[PDB]
Design a protein around this ligand. Structure first.
Ligand SMILES: Cc1cc2nc3c(=O)[nH]c(=O)nc-3n(C[C@H](O)[C@H](O)[C@H](O)COP(=O)(O)O)c2cc1C
Ligand SMILES: Cc1cc2nc3c(=O)[nH]c(=O)nc-3n(C[C@H](O)[C@H](O)[C@H](O)COP(=O)(O)O)c2cc1C
Ligand SMILES: COc1ccc2cccc(CCc3c(C(=O)O)[nH]c(=O)[nH]c3=O)c2c1
Ligand SMILES: COc1ccc2cccc(CCc3c(C(=O)O)[nH]c(=O)[nH]c3=O)c2c1
Lengths: 313, 313
C-alpha cells in the first residue's frame, strides 16, 4: 500500500534517502533531492570553511561499484546552515545535515550553531566520524578513544538527539567495542552503517593505471562490492544498540537490496553510488520494487520484517 | 613469452597457486593440486590437533563471491608435515605449508618441528596471522602488539625464511603500522595479501535468512567483492616492504585479474573462491588468459610489469 513511517519525531513518505555526499553539495543538488520521491535528504558533510577537495579525477564508477577520494569538497557550514534555516521546504520531507570537521573543536563549533536551527526547524544532525584524526592515528571512528571524546564533546555542545555515520568494521571485537562506545551517549539516536570501504584500489588493465588521481589511486569503495559488508554492519549495530535506530547504507541498487537492509535492521535506507549513477529517478523504482516484494510476501508494513533476518538453528 | 618465476630459492612454472583453505585439506586435495597446472600449492592452515570445524552450512558461493566461517577444519599438523616430508613430489612444483595456531605457543611448537623439513625438503612456511588470539580481542593481525609477539617468537623458533598471510586493512595508518611491524623481521620474506574481508553477512531475500550457520551468518568474504580491496593491500605492502615479496590473493577469476595483481606488485597469485567454484581446470585458463594479455602488450616476462601500476600525475 504505502511505505510512510515515523522516526525521530518526523514523518517520512518512505525509508529512502540519498547517502551523504551524493547529489547534495550545491543548492541545485538539494533542490533536486527535495523534488525527488525520496523520503528524506542529507546534505554533503561540511567543514567550517569551504573546500575545493582533491584533484580530478576523484570519483569513478564501474559495473560493480565506485571508488572515490573526493577530499570533502563542500560549500562550507554557513551555506548548509542557511539552506536548513531559510531555504529547505520542510513540508516536502525531512532534512539531515552532515558535518565532518577536521578536529573536535571545529565539530563543536559547528554543532553549537546548528542547535538553535535544529530546535527551530527540526533539521537532524548526522555526524560523520570518518573524519581526520591526530598524527599517526587512523580515522576517528577507528580510534575508539577519539570516538568517545568526539561524542562527549558533541553531545555536551549540541544537547539534542543526533546520529552518527560509521565506517565499516570487520572484526566482532570491534563491533563490540564500537557499539559500547555509542551506547554511552543517549543523545545518539541513530547509527548509519556504512561509509565507504576504505582505501580500495581500482586499476585499469588497458592503461595499466589507477583510475583516480589523489592518494596514488586509493579511495573508498561503494556499490555492489560492499553490500554484504554493509548488511553485516547494520545487523551488528542493530543487535548491539536496541535503544537506537540503525540506518543502512551500502550497495543498494534495488528494492530487493533495500529489503535486505531492512531485514538486517535498517530504519532508513540510504543510496550513494547507485544514485550517483542512475540519478534521482532511482527513488521511484526503489519504492515500487520494495512494495512489490512486500506484496508478494504478504507484508503490509516495514515493521513486520525489520530486523527479522533469520539465523540457522 | 613466459610465466616463469625464480624466488625464495625455488623455481615456479607460473605464478598461480591455490589460496590456503581451498582444495588443500586432504591428501587427495593435495595430490589434485599437485597434478594441476598451477605453479605451486599451499596446504590448509593447520593446528597441532585435528579439527572438525564449524557446523554446516559453513561456505556458500554466489555470482559475486563467497562467504565462509569454516572454523579451521583440518587434519592436524602431523598430517601436513608428513605430506611435506614424505609424500609431496617436489619435482612437480613447490609446496607451501600454512600454519594457524590458536596461541603463540602452538605456532612455536609447529614451526620448531617444521624447520628440519623446510631445510631438507624445501617446503615453505606461510604463517596465517588471522588466527584468533584471545576471544574478545581482534584477530592477531589486527592487534599489532600481538602480531609483533607472534613474529618475534616464530622467527626465533623457526630461524628460516617464511611468509605471512595478512587480513586486509582499510586505513592508511594501519598499512603504515602493519608494514612497519613486518619490516622488523628480516626472516619474513613474503607477505600474502589478502585473507577474506572479515565478518560480512549474506542474506537470501526469498528465505529471509542468512546463508551460513555459524556466527549468526557472519563470515569472511572472498571473490569479486574483494578485488579492489586485495589490490590496494598488495600495492600498499609492495610500496612499504621493499625487501620482501608480496603474493596477491583475492578476487582472481581471470588472467586480467591476475595481471592487475601483478601490476600492483604481486609475485605469486593465489586463487581461492574461483578455484573452489571452477575446480583445478581454472589454472590452464588463467595461464592462457595471462599469456594473451602479455602478447597483446608485448610483455615477455612477469618482471617487465610487476609493480609497474601507473599513477595519475
Ligand atoms: C562521491 C561520494 C562522496 C561521498 N561523500 C560523503 C560525505 O561527504 N559524507 C559521508 O558521510 N559519506 C560520503 N560518502 C559515502 C556514502 O555516503 C556512502 O556511505 C558510500 O558511498 C556507501 O554507499 P553506496 O554503496 O550506496 O555507495 C560519499 C560517497 C561518494 C561515492
Ligand atoms: C572455504 C575457504 C577456506 C579458507 N581457509 C583458509 C585457511 O585455512 N587459511 C588462510 O590463510 N586463508 C583461508 N581462506 C582464505 C583464502 O585463502 C583467501 O585469502 C580468500 O578466500 C580470498 O581470496 P579469493 O577472493 O580468491 O577467495 C579460506 C577461504 C575459503 C573460501
Ligand atoms: C579523502 O579526503 C578527505 C579529506 C578531508 C576529510 C574531512 C572530513 C571527512 C572526510 C571524509 C569525507 C568522505 C569522502 C570524501 O569526501 O572523500 N568520501 C567518502 O566516501 N566518505 C566520506 O566520508 C575527509 C576526506
Ligand atoms: C572461523 O573460525 C576459526 C576458528 C579457529 C581458527 C584458527 C586459526 C585460524 C582461523 C582462520 C581460518 C580461516 C578461515 C576458516 O577456516 O574459517 N576462513 C578464511 O576465509 N580464512 C582463514 O584464515 C580460525 C578460524
Amino acid at each position: 500500500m504505502c511505505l510512510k513511517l515515523n522516526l525521530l519525531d518526523h514523518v517520512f513518505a518512505n525509508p529512502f534517502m540519498n547517502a551523504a555526499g551524493v547529489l547534495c553539495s550545491t543548492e541545485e543538488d538539494l533542490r533536486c533531492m527535495t523534488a525527488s520521491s525520496s523520503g528524506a535528504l542529507v546534505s554533503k558533510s561540511c567543514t567550517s570553511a569551504p573546500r575545493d577537495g582533491n584533484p580530478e579525477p576523484r570519483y569513478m564508477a564501474f559495473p560493480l561499484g565506485s571508488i572515490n577520494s573526493m577530499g570533502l569538497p563542500n560549500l562550507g557550514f554557513d551555506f548548509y546552515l542557511k539552506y536548513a534555516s531559510d531555504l529547505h521546504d520542510y513540508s516536502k520531507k525531512p532534512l539531515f545535515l552532515s558535518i565532518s570537521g577536521l578536529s573536535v573543536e571545529e565539530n563543536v563549533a559547528m554543532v553549537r550553531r546548528l542547535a538553535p536551527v535544529a530546535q527551530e526547524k527540526g533539521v537532524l544532525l548526522e555526524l560523520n566520524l570518518s573524519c581526520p584524526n591526530v598524527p599517526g592515528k587512523p580515522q576517528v571512528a577507528y580510534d575508539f578513544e577519539a570516538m568517545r571524546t568526539y561524542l562527549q564533546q558533541v553531545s555536551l555542545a549540541y544537547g539534542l538527539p543526533f546520529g552518527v555515520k560509521m565506517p565499516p568494521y570487520f572484526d566482532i571485537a570491534h563491533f563490540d567495542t564500537a557499539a559500547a562506545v555509542l551506547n554511552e551517549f543517549p543523545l545518539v539516536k541513530f547509527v548509519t552503517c556504512v561509509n565507504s570501504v576504505g582505501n580500495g584500489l581500482v586499476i585499469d588493465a588497458e592503461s595499466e593505471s589507477v583510475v583516480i588521481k589523489p592518494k596514488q589511486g586509493f579511495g573508498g569503495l561503494g556499490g555492489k562490492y560492499i553490500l554484504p559488508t554493509a548488511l553485516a554492519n547494520v545487523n551488528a549495530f542493530y543487535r548491539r544498540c536496541p535503544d537506537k535506530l540503525v540506518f543502512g547504507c551500502g550497495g543498494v541498487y534495488s528494492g530487493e537490496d533495500a529489503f535486505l537492509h531492512i531485514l538486517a535492521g535498517a530504519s532508513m535506507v540510504q543510496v550513494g553510488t547507485a544514485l550517483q549513477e542512475e540519478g534521482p529517478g532511482i527513488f521511484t523504482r526503489l519504492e515500487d520494487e520494495l512494495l512489490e516484494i512486500m506484496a508478494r510476501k504478504g507484508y503490509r508494513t516495514l515493521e513486520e520484517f525489520r530486523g527479522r533476518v533469520k539465523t540457522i538453528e
